[PDB]
């Protein structure tokens, strides 16, 4: 049987113009890669700020069409319309937005935002939708007084939780979680992550979990994917990546994570050299300008994912070591 | 090739609607030319057949659009001059007034409707909006005669009515363009330009009054939606003077409904200035089209609606292009 | 020396043969052209124009005109005359309008609307050039009004020398668009719907104008015309709105000139419609109306109240008949005799446009409605745009319709014949559908008969029989008012509704 | 304890209160409506009865005026006050129907145009450019030829010349909103096209439409007055504020009241619909909650 | 002190039933200090920061005994004189960058305004210093990405544009509202090393509001822990997390993934925050606290000053052992 989600070589590129009559340049926001996602499983996505993760999340959610590659849900092509399927496929794949304030309609109350998923997709009467909305709000540490509020009369970590509540509402098969816990304190983060893990165990809900906080990914993930400059650089099980990181971007990334105990604290790699541009990405390996393991092929050829014991790594120095 | 889009369906729509509409109105140009007198049945049938009016409306329409496709708008049944040579001198006088009215109405209506939002609930807000809705709800005949009687007749500050001083004439031997503010500035004698702008003041005030209240209210409403947004909080916090938070940050986001009403009101200022043109004796398109419609001068109603329709399509296409300058997200 | 006149709207063009509007004749006939014979200013009286002398045959079928020596034409940037005025110019001026094979007949659309409306196609048999300075009109029947018809604006004389110069130059429309005439002024400019500039013609055969140039400032609003006149932007104006007349009487900077106008406003009863087919009902609906109140209210004192169709200042007026003067009591009694004391509904059609003869037909219909109301007749005011009003009125769809006439030529035939004759019924201008034999047998012989006393006698009888039969309310004759600056000398008000400037001085 | 739940109406009224001008506005609108519907129980006289001895009798406080006619009389001697109060009937009705129908169709077409974009938008925008080009008198004469002389055929002519303004202002708002993340998030929840434009986007578009509807009452009377210079308007003895102003504009420098009181009746009803519009903006504004 | 806040409170809603978003907060910052603010989502940290700048709008009401900056008590002076003090000498990094940048101007315009107001250079100097700042915040291609609109930025780029725009103000005090939310751990470390070299060289004050306990422990000099509108603990950054003085700070540190097994359920306080209608009498932590005495259910604990200079808003300030 096919995976619950299966991406193959997904690309997305954005037009940019310096002025209304200027030449239309192309931003390489995702020159991306395949993945398989199975039921009851979490795939975390980690990497540089601006490296394409939210762009990937928009493709998987069907917010945008890709500029290339394929996207299957359960063996059904998501990139062509089918009216008998699309009503079900729409409720079965859902998102938690990054910076979710702009994703909450300012002229709506939080109860209306959380009931809308139910009102479109279910038979639930008014009292049963209010019951579901308040029940989901309670499970993220909101309150019956918040159901009546407009989205600007909250803190950012409460807007995160309104976006989580809306995403988890439907019993979906996949949730694309775009920075879902970053504006939460560690006690509310623990409550939300415990809810996401309880739903993964009870419902079979899978996650694509986009996070910059590595301490959370080291806990919730089952597979982890590392991204740089629109492309994937390493993929494996969570033990493989956190115990033996092989791509020198992953080594520099995992090395910079803050840790509360003073002893545990270590010097970051202090990557030095010009950053690569999404408008003209360098020939060959994207990281070459800042990489410590410099070697001949890197400035010339595009590296690709090789197996090395199920740990997919896209690096010529790891190929030379092997 | 041309940028308008839908060029064939647009032309067939404007022309078939205008043609079928003027030919549904009861009466004929011959019947109205005769007035209270009779025209005998045998001479009425002759003169309709000579103008081409006895044929069925499908044949008459095809003959008209065949002529227009080959570059001919026809002959005006009032003036006996081609509809184009009648249109151009009047379109020029209508642009010259509609531009002065819009320059006044925007140059006053942008500052005043910004201040009415910045100073909400003040004596200024209620006075500026009250004054604006006063000018908006007087008939142009009453408002225009109040200005003529006060400013021109009592105060002696302005000329009464007309385009330029009645006994001062330009030479036709100079290459006149037909815009008196241009013509008198380049080829007029001493004081002749000052006279041409002195005749523009009251017409521009009266015609620009009905845009000014839309611009004042629309800019004020749009400002009140913007001044509470999180990026205006950032502009206040960045240490900018209040003039920059208002003019640079807020007004830029308020302009989109404002440039929409400027575009809609320019459409009215081409087609519909008739009451101001009547009071101020202005040789514009509004008097011309309504006199043609009343006389059943079918070529002038058909050709004038097509040449007003094209200028409206182009102004609406320009402000639709201008939305992407105001709000880059729309591009 | 310069005069500025504030015109009521704009001219349709500059050949007066093609056009029906007085605002065109003021721009295009009076200043630019002469006619064979012409009206003495302020009167109906015909005096020598381009003909010094004329003779009528004993049968009335031939009119001979002896043309004036030394009459010379205008000059234009495309034309200078070699000739004075010939009989050939007179012949072409009327052959253009009558003859389908003439070079100029179809030029500018061939809409010779007065020539054809007066029946001159039927009447004029020939236009003969007797000699270089003599012209003959031969007529298929005699008509006494014909000499006054040759005094109208369509009878203006056009140059054959210019006409065939423009025809061999391949541009015949210049005869109509770039005018050459014999008149006291020549056209320098026309700025479309704005202003007209004229120069006094230095070679004119009459008295040369005492103003060197004349300007029409086209000013379509009657209240703004008085503002231009108050400020001395303008020295003369037409058609003052009735409300300002009171103020103008008091204004020390102007003379408000007055003349009993040769026009009539009337409400026309459709005799083919069941309540109005009875003379008693038409008399009652007349007795029921307070005309003096309509004069004070609608006309604001600008009219004089009307008892029969011909204006009181015109020849042939029957002053020896007494009106159906306001008497509601009398009105109610006369509908009881008709069997209509139970009342009836009636349609009262009112034009939305202003007229010389009726300044507001809506508020007049609202007064006739209240007047008829008090007598038990339920008047319903109906109104249509002017083209639909003319169409359905000629088609006979109305019960009563507001109407009027402005005298073309000052002859009573121009009224009775054109408004209440069987012929007029045929052409659609008999808005009463009234054919009465005893009226016809008077008004007809009075058209043909040359004896002015017999015309006066038969028209006096036509007014007696028409008053007894009452085919209309006859409401009022408008006084024509001409606000003129005190600095203007020699102005005289024309009863035919034209404006003249050749005898006018500024000092 | 928690307060009583507030119905939308309750919230709307509660937040409409805070604007002292907006409730002065609604009080006037209910006063002219009460005066209009009950005019036959309140007006001094029957309109279309003429006091022929008193033509242009001035207001009761002027020299030669009389307490018999508080606001004086017109040029046919009718009471200006009785004509204003019966004149509130047709003027409020055609003003409200023109604004209601043009706002309804303008919202529908402008939502469809801005939401769907592309060929739909181009067709719709071309259509409303053609409607801006057609003179109002031409539409009026055509509607009279199809449907006969009626007050409703002036209301339809006035509806179609006003409709472009609502269509284009609605589209201009919808083009900003359709790009924002809450439209996307509602699409991901499963909202179809009707829910997206009418339930989710439209609440964010009202600030220009409240301005246009508040101005659109003035035009529905003054352009009815401009048609009233010709054969289109009310049946002549029956009062309407725009017609009874257009009939008397030659009495401006003499007899000032006949123009001035219909002028005040329109001006106040315009000024005070604009005060209600500010209150309706404030009551729908979440930042004021 | 540079900033001196005393009895600060902020209320939302009608005066009759105010929501105490900030509730007798009192703290100070010296020139060159870094102050961390830590606490539950909804505890008043943003609203406190907005109140000390006057950026709370009509539905909210601000009050204090003292609210003074650089020798001026900001409530007594004219709003004109408050504005031209606070805008010239104070800067803020707001929490959501997507709504805080103006939608209709390029990144370069929005940064170069700050350089013009606060530094005053010509247009070519303003571009060069904007490239220098965009390089300091590690934007991938600064000379092209000046000419980019906020909707074309990623969330962690728009965040770094407003860090650059705050540093462009050359301020005396900087309030940083979760300045590392949308940032990867490598660029997060660059931003903190940038803000601290700025504090060390230009002697500026810094206020780090953050949920990342490890980052504020490394960076801060003093930490303020905040709950339900009140300060609950205050003291030296290297002390607060080593041995905490308040049951809230203890239960917050217990929630970290560092103390949990490879896939297991994380620890947390077993309850929900007090709102408008269910606010305790006495201590605000009453229904959640493991150590709640009936004195807590009766009496509002004072901000009790301890022998080691640190403060705890508890009747029973915790020992080094982690017990009452
Ligand atoms: N609509 C757009 N138009 C142009 N450029 C865009 C657009 N949306 C995103 N980008 C660019 O696409 C690239 C990838 O951005 P993202 O998809 O947000 O990357 P990302 O890894 O999710 O970054 P984070 O997680 O949001 S910090 C960046 O260079 C963006 O500036
Ligand atoms: N306009 C408002 N009306 C009502 N409540 C509001 C309003 N704005 C904010 N709140 C409340 O203000 C309290 C404090 O909000 P913030 O200061 O923004 O929260 P915070 O401590 O910064 O939490 P984080 O760090 O931003 S998740 C929260 O409990 C909100 O419920
Ligand atoms: S391919 Fe070379 S430059 Fe790229 S990550 Fe590997 S070692 Fe570094
Ligand atoms: S005072 Fe009591 S309830 Fe409050 S934190 Fe201390 S032990 Fe807990």
Numbering used by the authors:
A (entry chain D): 9 to 330
B (entry chain A): 6 to 336
C (entry chain F): 29 to 535
D (entry chain B): 11 to 299
E (entry chain C): 2 to 325
What does the paper say about this structure?
In Gram-negative bacteria, the full Dpp transporter is composed of five subunits: two integral membrane proteins (DppB and DppC) that form a translocation pathway for substrates; two ATPases (DppD and DppF) that bind and hydrolyze ATP during transport and a periplasm-localized SBP (DppA) for substrate capture. The Dpp transporter is primarily responsible for importing dipeptides but also capable of inefficiently importing tri- and tetrapeptides into the cell. Different from those structurally and mechanistically well-characterized ABC exporters that solely consist of two variable transmembrane domains (TMDs) and two highly conserved nucleotide-binding domains (NBDs), the ABC peptide importers require an additional substrate-binding protein (SBP) that captures peptide substrates and delivers them to the translocator for function. Unlike the reported heterotrimeric Mycobacterium tuberculosis DppBCD translocator, the E. coli DppBCDF translocator is a heterotetramer, with a [4Fe-4S] cluster at the C-terminus of each ATPase subunit.
Using this strategy, we determined the ATPγS-bound DppABCDE179QFE187Q complex structure at 2.73 Å by addition of ATPγS and Mg2+ prior to cryo-EM sample preparation, and we refer to this structure as ATPγS-DppABCDF unless otherwise specified. Structure reveals that DppABCDF forms a compact pentameric structure with an approximate dimension of 70 × 70 × 140 Å. A DppA molecule caps at the top of the two integral membrane proteins, DppB and DppC, in the periplasm, and two ATPases, DppD and DppF, adopt a closed conformation in the cytosol. Unlike apo-DppBCDF and ATPγS (or AMPPNP)-DppBCDF, which adopt an inward-facing conformation, ATPγS-DppABCDF adopts an outward-facing conformation with two ATPγS molecules bound at the interface of the two NBDs. In ATPγS-DppABCDF, a striking rearrangement of the TM helices of both DppB and DppC, which form the substrate translocation pathway, results in the opening of the periplasmic substrate entry gate. Specifically, the periplasmic substrate entry gate is open to approximately 9.0 Å in diameter in ATPγS-DppABCDF. The two ATPγS molecules act as molecular glues, shortening the Cα–Cα distance between the D-loop T182DppD and the opposite D-loop S190DppF in the RecA-like subdomain from 10.4 to 5.6 Å. However, in ATPγS-DppABCDF, the DppB scoop motif, which consists of two short α helices (α1 and α2) connected by a scoop loop, is clearly resolved. In particular, its α1 helix and α2 helix interact with the C-lobe and the N-lobe of DppA, respectively, whereas the side chains of two conserved charged residues, E41DppB and R42DppB, from the scoop loop form two salt bridges with side chains of residues R383DppA and D436DppA. Taken together, these findings suggest that concurrent binding of DppA and ATP to DppBCDF does induce conformational changes of translocator, and the ATPγS-DppABCDF structure snapshots a typical pre-catalytic (or ATP-bound) state of the transporter.
